[PDB]
């Protein structure tokens, strides 16, 4: 899937392009209706940012001309423009690189962002990642109603966390609990063990429960002291 | 309690040699009269053949039908019994086991399971069963060598599935079935591993 997918959309790349807009949600549908470079929104990090990409001329328009009535944009650095009626006329390729797959049952709950419910491992296959290719994910709306059903750990798994904002911006408004914790893996100014150990502690010091005997494969448990009591003066005439 | 471990099991062809091992762990080996006892389908136990420890002698006794066939050694120095099988028969594909004690058949090890084969190894055949009587499946025939996987729908339906042990014929290659059972889409996926092939074949219902 991930090579093949690579070097389907190398071919594209190089042609249109993307850049991440805050200033609302069908707001933004109706400033760029007048253009047909769009069929959908391509993601929504939350409800109040979105992402359009699109064909070069089109998303320069839009880009010099909301630039004087709002929320600044941001051009994303992307050779190619997904999410976009621009992948359809390149379906074939794509169905005969992976028309070959065997979907096994999934152990955990993998919770879709393209169908917006929780699938089954036997439901993927060429179709399910090019609708995933193709149409949007709704990535808010998912750690929304996520964080209603009883998860209160959304731990973060990548070189550099960039959707913490959006992640806190979206179960800050559900009716859940709100000191659900959310923790990255890296950072940009670290990749060694210390920092992935300071992540860890920091999921661990608000409720998960973290085995602390893999780090110290070679040590002995030492002598230690006790806990230290804070005593009052508790005394009934005897 | 203590252990018997085993080894040497495989494929044969007939009429030639092959030679198991069997070391003990626990106890003195230089003491123990050991016993050795065949196992094939279709049949119970069979006692073949025993060897007399040492500070007895070195007599060894066979069974009939194997007298001038089998041979049994041991080394208590290294502490091995052995059995040296010249000139096999297609009859005896069979797990052994090596029993402690001459007459007190007391302990029993784990076994391995040797067989002699005729027939070279060759992909199955999957034929769809069409009820003509609700039940529906699928045979595998003429495979080799064990053993084979039956799945249904990928590993989605696995209740009323009924699996069959793959009884040998009269020919040397291996066939069962595989029904399940559904009121009233349907396909079994059969996959023979040292062959490398998987079939995905539908069944009518």
């Known amino acids: 899937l991930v090579v093949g997918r690579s070097r389907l959309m190398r071919s594209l790349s190089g042609e249109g392009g993307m850049a991440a807009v805050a200033l609302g949600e069908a707001a933004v549908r109706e400033r760029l209706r007048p253009w047909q470079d769009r069929l959908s929104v391509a993601a929504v990090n939350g409800p109040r940012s979105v992402v359009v990409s699109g064909e070069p001329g089109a998303l320069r328009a839009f880009s010099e001309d909301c630039a004087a009535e709002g929320i600044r944009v941001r051009d994303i650095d992307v050779d190619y423009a997904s999410h976009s009626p621009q992948i359809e006329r390149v379906r074939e390729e794509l169905l005969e690189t992976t028309g070959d797959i065997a979907p096994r049952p999934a152990r955990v709950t993998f919770h879709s962002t393209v169908e917006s419910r929780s699938m089954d491992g036997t439901e993927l296959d060429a179709r399910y990642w090019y609708r995933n290719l193709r149409e949007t994910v709704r990535f808010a709306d998912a750690v929304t109603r996520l964080a209603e059903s009883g998860y209160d750990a959304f731990i973060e798994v990548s070189p550099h966390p960039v959707v913490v904002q959006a992640v806190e911006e979206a179960v800050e408004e559900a009716d859940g609990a709100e000191d659900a914790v959310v923790v990255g893996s890296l950072h940009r100014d670290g990749g060694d063990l210390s920092a992935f150990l300071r992540s860890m502690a920091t999921a661990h010091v608000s409720g998960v429960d973290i085995r602390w005997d893999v780090a110290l494969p070679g040590a002995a448990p030492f002598a230690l002291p006790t806990y230290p009591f804070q005593r009052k003066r508790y005394w009934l005439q005897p | 309690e203590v252990q018997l471990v085993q080894s040497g099991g495989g494929l044969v062809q007939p009429g030639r040699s092959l030679r198991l091992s069997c070391t003990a762990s626990?106890?003195?080996?230089?003491?123990?009269?050991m016993s050795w006892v065949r196992q094939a389908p279709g049949k119970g136990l069979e006692w073949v053949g025993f060897?007399?420890?040492?500070?007895?002698?070195?007599?060894?006794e066979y069974a009939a039908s194997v007298k001038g066939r089998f041979t049994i050694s041991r080394d208590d120095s290294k502490s091995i019994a052995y059995l040296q099988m010249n000139s096999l028969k297609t009859e005896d594909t069979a797990v052994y086991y090596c029993?402690?004690?001459?007459?007190?058949?007391?302990?029993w090890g784990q076994g391995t399971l040797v067989t002699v084969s005729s027939a070279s190894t060759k992909g199955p055949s999957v034929f769809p069963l069409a009820p003509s009587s609700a039940a529906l499946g699928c045979l595998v025939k003429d495979y080799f060598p064990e053993p084979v996987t039956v799945s249904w729908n990928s590993g989605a339906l696995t209740s009323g599935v009924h699996t069959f042990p793959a009884v040998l014929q009269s020919s040397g290659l291996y066939s069962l079935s595989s029904v399940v059972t559904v009121p009233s889409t349907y396909i079994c996926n059969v996959n023979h591993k040292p062959s490398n092939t998987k079939v995905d074949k539908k069944v009518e219902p």
């Open positions: 029993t402690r004690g001459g007459t007190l058949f007391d302990y």
């Open positions: 626990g106890f003195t080996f230089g003491d123990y009269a």
């Open positions: 060897i007399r420890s040492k500070a007895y002698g070195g007599t060894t």
